[PDB]
Design a protein around this nucleic acid. Structure first.
Ligand code: MG
Ligand code: MG
Ligand code: MG
Ligand code: MG
Ligand code: MG
Ligand code: MG
Ligand code: MG
Ligand code: MG
Ligand code: MG
Ligand code: MG
Ligand code: MG
Ligand code: MG
Ligand code: MG
Ligand code: MG
Ligand code: ZN
Lengths: 72, 143, 124, 55
RNA sequence: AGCGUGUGCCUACCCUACGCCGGCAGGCGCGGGUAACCCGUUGAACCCCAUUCGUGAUGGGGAUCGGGGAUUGCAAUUAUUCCCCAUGAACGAGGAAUUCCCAGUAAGUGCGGGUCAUAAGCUUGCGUUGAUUAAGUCCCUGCCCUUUGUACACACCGCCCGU
């Protein structure tokens, strides 16, 4: 079926991102996009904001692939 | 990153429906007569940020974009960018849009048909127009 | 309702010189005029002018025949009867004001439109 | 007159302005290094010209 | 990176550095090369590093058309070729069947030569990135040998019998 992903965060989805994503043990824009029904660009923006706030560690950054993890 | 309280999921511009979830640069290409290059140069001329969605724009920005799109020559857009340079009937440079393009193509075909030029006859018959071979290709759409 | 070619009506077109008409034409016609016309085109123009001068006030001019299929239709030709050779026969064409800028060969078709018959044995 | 019409068509370029230097044929012409021969005449005279088959 | 080409008996048609103009196709000047000497240290493309997009026939794909501009030609219409806006088709990996290939090979990616006034979706060469599988068999296809049968020798597309 058709895949309708949110392009701008809602209240419930923003709460989900702020509460559950920082505990995933493997954070990736594709993973967050598939779990939160979000587009890739919004997922990348949200992950960059979380990295700026310091709530998430970054493992490796590449144009093809960016890898995040929960804080120790 | 949260959606603004006033967000347009669907916009009505020039009798065309614009999807507010697409980025403004590619959203307005849904108008017939606007491509990626023309949309990008119009938006660069309107001093509008290209990192936002179409639904995030205010009414002032939308009307400014429409005004700049209607009259390119006023806003330093070059003649070579336009798609209707040097009109045959009146000789005026302009950019033709959704319905105007549809009737301008009709008039361009009618001119060739009435004068009975070869290209007009080919258009009337339904055959290829730019000298291509027809023996083996173009079968689709024919009985 | 009145005919205008890129905002210019027929009278001004007739008054203009070739240099002024070059800027109204398209790139191909402008290049052709810039390279100049040869003796045969001038002879055809002279014959057309001679034929149009001798026409009765209410009648059409006599048909002038030619093989020049690459001749550009100038504004001075409007209203003349030209037979254009298509390789087998001279097809009669009356120059209309909306033909300015085209070739003569565009108005005398060089082939018969195809009406298909039953395919033969050698078709599979 | 006839003097003007005869051979009037320009022949400064194209297939009609070039021919083999041995048999005067206009097809399959070799112009590399200024040979100006058709392929058959070249194959006939290659050893005399100095072209050897090594591979 | 590599292989190569470059001013021509007839024979008109060469490869181009640098400066300026144009947004681009291009236009003006002014120099080198008959060549390990000049183009040229041939700043090639895939590839590499970042940016944007986000499963939507979509910013995939680029067919078909409209309007303009420029180059080759004696001549461009039945669009020579090239450039710019606009338009945005089928196509979501392909039935029966079938081709080529064992290591710097297959495939991907560009560059020269031929044709060439204008000129490569073809061919002939050259590099660059670079594998999976196999070190066997006569099952399919085909071709060779040996034995064997023949009423065939125009040689099974043969010869030949009866209504
Ligand atoms: Mg559009
Ligand atoms: Mg053709
Ligand atoms: Mg067909
Ligand atoms: Mg599309
Ligand atoms: Mg598309
Ligand atoms: Mg055109
Ligand atoms: Mg034809
Ligand atoms: Mg385009
Ligand atoms: Mg090649
Ligand atoms: Mg070539
Ligand atoms: Mg061929
Ligand atoms: Mg076998
Ligand atoms: Mg036996
Ligand atoms: Mg025997
Ligand atoms: Zn020969």
């Amino acid at each position: 079926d058709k895949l309708n992903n949110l392009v701008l965060f809602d209240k419930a989805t923003y709460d989900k991102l702020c509460k559950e994503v920082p505990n995933y043990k493997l954070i990736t824009p594709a993973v967050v996009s598939e779990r939160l029904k979000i587009r890739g660009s919004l997922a990348r923006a949200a992950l960059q904001e979380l990295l700026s706030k310091g709530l998430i560690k970054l493992v490796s950054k590449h144009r093809a692939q960016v890898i995040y993890t929960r804080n120790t | 990153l949260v959606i603004p309280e006033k967000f347009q999921h669907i916009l009505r511009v020039l009798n065309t429906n614009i999807d507010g979830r697409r980025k403004i640069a590619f959203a307005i290409t849904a108008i017939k007569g606007v491509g990626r290059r023309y949309a990008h140069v119009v938006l660069r001329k309107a001093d509008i940020d290209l990192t936002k969605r179409a639904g995030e724009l205010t009414e002032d920005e939308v009307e400014r974009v429409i005004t700049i799109m209607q009259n390119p020559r006023q806003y330093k857009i070059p003649d070579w960018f336009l798609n209707r340079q040097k009109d045959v009937k009146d000789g005026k440079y302009s950019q033709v849009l959704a319905n105007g393009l549809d009737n301008k193509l009709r008039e361009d075909l009618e001119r060739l048909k009435k004068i009975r030029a070869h290209r007009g006859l080919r258009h009337f018959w339904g055959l290829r127009v730019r000298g291509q071979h027809t023996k083996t290709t173009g079968r689709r759409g024919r009985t | 309702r009145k005919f205008t070619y890129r905002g210019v009506d027929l009278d001004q077109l007739l008054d203009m010189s070739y240099e002024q008409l070059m800027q109204l034409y398209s790139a191909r016609q402008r290049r052709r005029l810039n390279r100049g016309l040869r003796r045969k085109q001038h002879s055809l123009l002279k014959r057309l002018r001679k034929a149009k001068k001798e026409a009765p006030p209410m009648e059409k001019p006599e048909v002038v025949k030619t093989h020049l299929r690459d001749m550009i239709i100038l504004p001075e030709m409007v209203g003349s009867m030209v037979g254009v050779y298509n390789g087998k026969t001279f097809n009669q064409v009356e120059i209309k004001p909306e033909m300015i800028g085209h070739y003569l060969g565009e108005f005398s078709i060089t082939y018969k439109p195809v009406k298909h018959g039953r395919p033969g044995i050698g078709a599979t | 007159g006839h003097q003007q019409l005869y051979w009037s068509h320009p022949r400064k370029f194209g297939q009609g302005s070039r021919s083999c230097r041995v048999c005067s044929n206009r097809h399959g012409l070799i112009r590399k290094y200024g040979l100006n021969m058709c392929r058959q005449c070249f194959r006939q005279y290659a050893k005399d010209i100095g072209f050897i088959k090594l591979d």
